[PDB]
Design a protein around this ligand. Structure first.
Ligand SMILES: [Co+2]
Ligand SMILES: [Co+2]
Length: 322
Protein backbone atom coordinates (compact mmCIF):
# COMPACT_ATOMS: atom_id res chain seq x y z
CA UNK A 1 0.00 0.00 0.00
CA UNK A 2 0.90 3.69 -0.44
CA UNK A 3 1.22 5.78 2.71
CA UNK A 4 -0.61 9.10 2.23
CA UNK A 5 -1.29 12.03 4.59
CA UNK A 6 -4.80 10.61 5.25
CA UNK A 7 -3.53 7.02 5.66
CA UNK A 8 -2.79 3.79 3.76
CA UNK A 9 -4.30 3.56 0.25
CA UNK A 10 -4.26 0.56 -2.14
CA UNK A 11 -2.03 0.58 -5.27
CA UNK A 12 -5.09 0.24 -7.54
CA UNK A 13 -6.70 3.28 -5.88
CA UNK A 14 -3.89 5.76 -6.65
CA UNK A 15 -5.10 6.27 -10.23
CA UNK A 16 -3.43 8.97 -12.34
CA UNK A 17 -0.59 10.49 -10.33
CA UNK A 18 1.80 13.44 -10.54
CA UNK A 19 5.02 11.95 -8.97
CA UNK A 20 6.74 15.26 -8.04
CA UNK A 21 4.87 18.45 -7.02
CA UNK A 22 4.91 20.92 -4.10
CA UNK A 23 1.63 22.05 -2.44
CA UNK A 24 3.74 24.49 -0.38
CA UNK A 25 7.47 25.24 -0.82
CA UNK A 26 9.90 27.66 0.71
CA UNK A 27 13.55 27.84 -0.25
CA UNK A 28 15.78 27.60 2.91
CA UNK A 29 15.81 30.96 4.69
CA UNK A 30 12.11 31.77 4.10
CA UNK A 31 11.39 31.45 7.85
CA UNK A 32 13.83 34.27 8.45
CA UNK A 33 11.66 36.64 6.37
CA UNK A 34 8.53 35.88 8.46
CA UNK A 35 7.89 39.59 9.30
CA UNK A 36 7.25 40.78 5.72
CA UNK A 37 6.44 37.36 4.33
CA UNK A 38 4.09 35.62 6.82
CA UNK A 39 2.10 32.48 6.11
CA UNK A 40 -1.53 33.34 5.41
CA UNK A 41 -3.01 29.91 6.26
CA UNK A 42 -6.53 30.78 5.07
CA UNK A 43 -5.36 32.13 1.68
CA UNK A 44 -2.98 29.18 1.28
CA UNK A 45 -5.75 26.65 2.04
CA UNK A 46 -8.09 28.39 -0.43
CA UNK A 47 -5.54 28.44 -3.27
CA UNK A 48 -4.30 24.86 -2.70
CA UNK A 49 -7.80 23.34 -2.45
CA UNK A 50 -8.78 25.12 -5.70
CA UNK A 51 -5.74 23.64 -7.50
CA UNK A 52 -6.50 20.21 -5.94
CA UNK A 53 -10.11 20.28 -7.23
CA UNK A 54 -8.83 21.34 -10.67
CA UNK A 55 -6.55 18.26 -10.66
CA UNK A 56 -9.41 15.94 -9.63
CA UNK A 57 -11.40 17.34 -12.58
CA UNK A 58 -8.57 16.19 -14.90
CA UNK A 59 -8.76 12.66 -13.47
CA UNK A 60 -5.62 13.06 -11.30
CA UNK A 61 -6.39 11.37 -7.98
CA UNK A 62 -2.93 11.44 -6.41
CA UNK A 63 -0.05 13.89 -6.00
CA UNK A 64 3.33 12.99 -4.48
CA UNK A 65 4.55 16.07 -2.60
CA UNK A 66 8.34 16.00 -2.84
CA UNK A 67 9.00 18.82 -0.35
CA UNK A 68 12.18 18.23 1.77
CA UNK A 69 12.15 18.67 5.58
CA UNK A 70 14.16 21.91 5.32
CA UNK A 71 12.12 23.37 2.44
CA UNK A 72 8.86 24.25 4.19
CA UNK A 73 7.36 20.76 4.55
CA UNK A 74 4.05 20.86 6.46
CA UNK A 75 2.35 17.39 6.67
CA UNK A 76 -0.60 18.82 8.66
CA UNK A 77 -1.37 21.35 5.91
CA UNK A 78 -1.18 18.63 3.21
CA UNK A 79 -3.69 16.63 5.28
CA UNK A 80 -6.07 19.64 5.36
CA UNK A 81 -5.89 20.04 1.56
CA UNK A 82 -6.46 16.27 1.16
CA UNK A 83 -9.39 16.01 3.61
CA UNK A 84 -11.13 19.03 2.07
CA UNK A 85 -10.96 17.82 -1.56
CA UNK A 86 -10.47 14.05 -1.59
CA UNK A 87 -7.15 14.33 -3.49
CA UNK A 88 -4.61 11.79 -2.21
CA UNK A 89 -1.28 13.35 -1.18
CA UNK A 90 1.98 11.54 -0.27
CA UNK A 91 4.60 13.57 1.59
CA UNK A 92 8.37 13.16 1.81
CA UNK A 93 11.17 12.73 4.34
CA UNK A 94 14.66 13.95 3.49
CA UNK A 95 16.80 17.06 3.06
CA UNK A 96 17.63 19.18 -0.01
CA UNK A 97 21.04 19.32 -1.81
CA UNK A 98 24.22 20.86 -0.28
CA UNK A 99 24.23 24.04 -2.39
CA UNK A 100 20.58 24.59 -1.50
CA UNK A 101 20.98 26.03 2.00
CA UNK A 102 19.95 24.69 5.46
CA UNK A 103 22.89 22.29 5.18
CA UNK A 104 25.05 23.35 8.15
CA UNK A 105 23.04 21.56 10.93
CA UNK A 106 23.67 18.04 9.63
CA UNK A 107 27.14 18.99 8.31
CA UNK A 108 27.93 19.91 11.95
CA UNK A 109 26.34 16.71 13.41
CA UNK A 110 28.59 14.82 10.92
CA UNK A 111 31.90 16.41 11.97
CA UNK A 112 30.92 15.78 15.61
CA UNK A 113 29.56 12.25 15.22
CA UNK A 114 27.52 9.62 13.42
CA UNK A 115 25.07 11.69 11.33
CA UNK A 116 24.20 8.79 8.98
CA UNK A 117 22.47 6.95 11.86
CA UNK A 118 20.69 10.11 13.02
CA UNK A 119 19.45 10.71 9.43
CA UNK A 120 18.47 7.01 9.18
CA UNK A 121 16.50 7.17 12.45
CA UNK A 122 14.74 10.37 11.25
CA UNK A 123 13.71 8.77 7.93
CA UNK A 124 12.68 5.47 9.58
CA UNK A 125 10.54 7.20 12.24
CA UNK A 126 8.91 9.54 9.69
CA UNK A 127 8.09 6.57 7.41
CA UNK A 128 6.89 4.05 10.05
CA UNK A 129 5.57 6.13 12.99
CA UNK A 130 5.00 9.74 11.92
CA UNK A 131 6.28 13.29 11.43
CA UNK A 132 6.54 15.73 14.39
CA UNK A 133 4.26 13.65 16.63
CA UNK A 134 1.26 14.14 14.31
CA UNK A 135 0.95 10.51 13.19
CA UNK A 136 1.18 11.57 9.54
CA UNK A 137 3.72 9.35 7.83
CA UNK A 138 5.96 10.04 4.85
CA UNK A 139 5.16 7.89 1.83
CA UNK A 140 8.42 8.56 -0.02
CA UNK A 141 12.03 9.39 0.77
CA UNK A 142 13.39 12.48 -1.01
CA UNK A 143 17.09 12.56 -1.92
CA UNK A 144 19.06 15.29 -3.63
CA UNK A 145 22.54 15.66 -5.14
CA UNK A 146 24.72 18.53 -6.42
CA UNK A 147 25.75 19.13 -10.07
CA UNK A 148 29.45 18.18 -10.05
CA UNK A 149 29.24 15.13 -7.73
CA UNK A 150 27.13 13.42 -5.06
CA UNK A 151 29.14 15.09 -2.26
CA UNK A 152 30.27 13.22 0.95
CA UNK A 153 27.52 15.11 2.90
CA UNK A 154 24.82 14.09 0.40
CA UNK A 155 26.01 10.46 0.49
CA UNK A 156 25.04 10.25 4.18
CA UNK A 157 21.37 10.62 3.18
CA UNK A 158 21.73 8.14 0.28
CA UNK A 159 23.15 5.39 2.52
CA UNK A 160 20.55 6.16 5.21
CA UNK A 161 17.67 6.06 2.69
CA UNK A 162 18.92 2.83 1.11
CA UNK A 163 18.71 1.16 4.53
CA UNK A 164 15.15 2.42 5.26
CA UNK A 165 14.20 1.16 1.78
CA UNK A 166 15.49 -2.40 2.41
CA UNK A 167 13.57 -2.57 5.71
CA UNK A 168 10.25 -0.94 4.75
CA UNK A 169 10.04 -1.09 0.95
CA UNK A 170 9.27 2.68 0.91
CA UNK A 171 9.69 4.53 -2.45
CA UNK A 172 12.69 6.77 -3.17
CA UNK A 173 12.35 9.90 -5.31
CA UNK A 174 15.24 12.20 -6.12
CA UNK A 175 16.43 15.62 -7.32
CA UNK A 176 19.28 15.99 -9.85
CA UNK A 177 20.97 19.37 -10.27
CA UNK A 178 21.46 20.86 -13.79
CA UNK A 179 20.88 17.55 -15.61
CA UNK A 180 23.84 15.78 -14.01
CA UNK A 181 24.46 12.86 -11.57
CA UNK A 182 21.55 10.64 -12.74
CA UNK A 183 23.62 7.47 -13.59
CA UNK A 184 25.68 8.02 -10.42
CA UNK A 185 22.57 8.23 -8.18
CA UNK A 186 21.15 5.09 -9.76
CA UNK A 187 24.49 3.24 -9.43
CA UNK A 188 24.96 4.25 -5.78
CA UNK A 189 21.40 3.38 -4.67
CA UNK A 190 21.36 -0.01 -6.46
CA UNK A 191 24.83 -1.00 -5.16
CA UNK A 192 23.54 -0.35 -1.62
CA UNK A 193 20.76 -2.90 -2.13
CA UNK A 194 17.85 -0.49 -2.72
CA UNK A 195 15.00 -1.89 -4.88
CA UNK A 196 15.36 -0.45 -8.47
CA UNK A 197 11.59 -0.87 -8.99
CA UNK A 198 10.98 1.58 -6.10
CA UNK A 199 13.47 4.28 -7.19
CA UNK A 200 12.61 7.34 -9.29
CA UNK A 201 15.54 9.49 -10.41
CA UNK A 202 14.14 13.01 -10.80
CA UNK A 203 14.86 16.12 -12.90
CA UNK A 204 15.97 13.82 -15.70
CA UNK A 205 14.43 16.25 -18.18
CA UNK A 206 17.26 18.65 -17.35
CA UNK A 207 19.46 16.81 -19.89
CA UNK A 208 18.75 16.74 -23.66
CA UNK A 209 21.15 13.90 -24.62
CA UNK A 210 19.20 10.55 -24.62
CA UNK A 211 22.45 8.58 -24.02
CA UNK A 212 22.51 10.03 -20.47
CA UNK A 213 18.98 8.70 -19.85
CA UNK A 214 19.83 5.22 -21.20
CA UNK A 215 22.93 5.17 -18.94
CA UNK A 216 20.65 5.81 -15.90
CA UNK A 217 18.02 3.31 -17.09
CA UNK A 218 20.72 0.58 -17.30
CA UNK A 219 20.49 0.28 -13.50
CA UNK A 220 16.80 -0.65 -13.71
CA UNK A 221 15.53 2.49 -12.03
CA UNK A 222 12.61 4.61 -13.24
CA UNK A 223 13.23 8.17 -14.44
CA UNK A 224 11.05 11.27 -14.18
CA UNK A 225 10.67 14.10 -16.67
CA UNK A 226 9.42 16.11 -13.71
CA UNK A 227 9.96 19.83 -14.40
CA UNK A 228 7.60 19.92 -17.40
CA UNK A 229 6.37 23.44 -18.05
CA UNK A 230 9.46 25.19 -16.66
CA UNK A 231 11.01 26.26 -19.98
CA UNK A 232 14.42 27.94 -20.23
CA UNK A 233 14.72 28.89 -16.56
CA UNK A 234 18.31 28.71 -15.24
CA UNK A 235 19.39 25.87 -17.54
CA UNK A 236 16.12 23.92 -17.97
CA UNK A 237 15.18 22.90 -21.56
CA UNK A 238 12.00 23.67 -23.53
CA UNK A 239 8.98 21.32 -23.44
CA UNK A 240 9.67 20.58 -27.14
CA UNK A 241 13.23 19.46 -26.28
CA UNK A 242 11.81 17.31 -23.44
CA UNK A 243 9.20 15.62 -25.65
CA UNK A 244 11.82 14.92 -28.34
CA UNK A 245 13.90 12.93 -25.82
CA UNK A 246 10.77 11.29 -24.33
CA UNK A 247 9.49 10.02 -27.73
CA UNK A 248 12.96 8.56 -28.53
CA UNK A 249 12.84 6.63 -25.22
CA UNK A 250 9.16 5.63 -25.64
CA UNK A 251 10.08 4.27 -29.09
CA UNK A 252 12.79 2.16 -27.42
CA UNK A 253 10.29 0.45 -25.08
CA UNK A 254 11.07 2.44 -21.92
CA UNK A 255 7.36 3.33 -21.25
CA UNK A 256 7.31 1.20 -18.08
CA UNK A 257 10.15 3.22 -16.53
CA UNK A 258 9.22 6.81 -17.57
CA UNK A 259 7.28 9.24 -15.29
CA UNK A 260 5.84 12.77 -15.79
CA UNK A 261 5.35 15.74 -13.40
CA UNK A 262 5.74 19.57 -13.23
CA UNK A 263 7.69 20.28 -9.98
CA UNK A 264 5.15 23.10 -9.52
CA UNK A 265 4.73 25.18 -6.38
CA UNK A 266 1.06 25.93 -5.59
CA UNK A 267 1.81 28.31 -2.70
CA UNK A 268 5.20 29.84 -1.94
CA UNK A 269 6.40 30.22 1.64
CA UNK A 270 7.87 33.60 2.59
CA UNK A 271 7.23 36.55 0.26
CA UNK A 272 5.39 35.91 -3.06
CA UNK A 273 7.91 35.79 -5.99
CA UNK A 274 8.58 38.84 -8.12
CA UNK A 275 8.91 37.22 -11.56
CA UNK A 276 10.75 39.54 -14.08
CA UNK A 277 9.18 40.55 -17.43
CA UNK A 278 11.70 38.47 -19.44
CA UNK A 279 10.94 35.34 -17.37
CA UNK A 280 7.17 35.21 -18.13
CA UNK A 281 7.26 32.68 -21.05
CA UNK A 282 9.53 30.45 -18.93
CA UNK A 283 6.98 29.97 -16.12
CA UNK A 284 3.79 30.25 -18.26
CA UNK A 285 3.17 26.50 -18.49
CA UNK A 286 4.66 25.76 -15.03
CA UNK A 287 1.44 24.83 -13.22
CA UNK A 288 0.01 21.38 -12.32
CA UNK A 289 -2.72 21.31 -15.02
CA UNK A 290 -0.25 21.54 -17.95
CA UNK A 291 0.38 17.80 -18.44
CA UNK A 292 -3.31 16.94 -18.48
CA UNK A 293 -4.24 19.82 -20.81
CA UNK A 294 -1.25 20.12 -23.13
CA UNK A 295 1.34 17.30 -22.81
CA UNK A 296 -0.68 14.03 -22.86
CA UNK A 297 -2.85 15.22 -25.83
CA UNK A 298 0.31 16.34 -27.69
CA UNK A 299 1.89 12.90 -27.04
CA UNK A 300 -1.24 11.19 -28.42
CA UNK A 301 -0.92 13.42 -31.52
CA UNK A 302 2.76 12.40 -31.91
CA UNK A 303 1.98 8.68 -32.09
CA UNK A 304 2.18 7.65 -28.42
CA UNK A 305 -0.62 5.17 -27.61
CA UNK A 306 -3.30 5.42 -24.89
CA UNK A 307 -1.66 2.34 -23.34
CA UNK A 308 1.78 4.04 -23.18
CA UNK A 309 0.21 7.19 -21.66
CA UNK A 310 -1.69 5.09 -19.12
CA UNK A 311 1.55 3.22 -18.31
CA UNK A 312 3.54 6.40 -17.52
CA UNK A 313 0.72 8.11 -15.58
CA UNK A 314 -1.20 5.23 -13.92
CA UNK A 315 0.82 1.98 -14.31
CA UNK A 316 4.26 3.23 -13.23
CA UNK A 317 3.12 5.09 -10.10
CA UNK A 318 0.93 2.16 -8.90
CA UNK A 319 4.08 -0.01 -9.01
CA UNK A 320 6.54 2.62 -7.70
CA UNK A 321 4.40 4.18 -4.92
CA UNK A 322 1.72 1.62 -4.14
CO1 LIG B 1 14.32 19.37 -7.06
CO1 LIG C 1 10.81 19.59 -6.31
Amino acid sequence: TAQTVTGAVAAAQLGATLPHEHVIFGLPGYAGDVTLGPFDHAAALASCTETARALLARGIQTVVDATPNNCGRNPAFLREVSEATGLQILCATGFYYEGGGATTYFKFRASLGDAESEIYEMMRTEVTEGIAGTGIRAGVIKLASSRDAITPYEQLFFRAAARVQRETGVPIITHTQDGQQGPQQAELLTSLGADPARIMIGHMDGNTDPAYHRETLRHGVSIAFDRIGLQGMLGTPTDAERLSVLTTLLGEGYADRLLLSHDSIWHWMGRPPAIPEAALPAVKDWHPLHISDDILPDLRRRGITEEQVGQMTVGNPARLFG
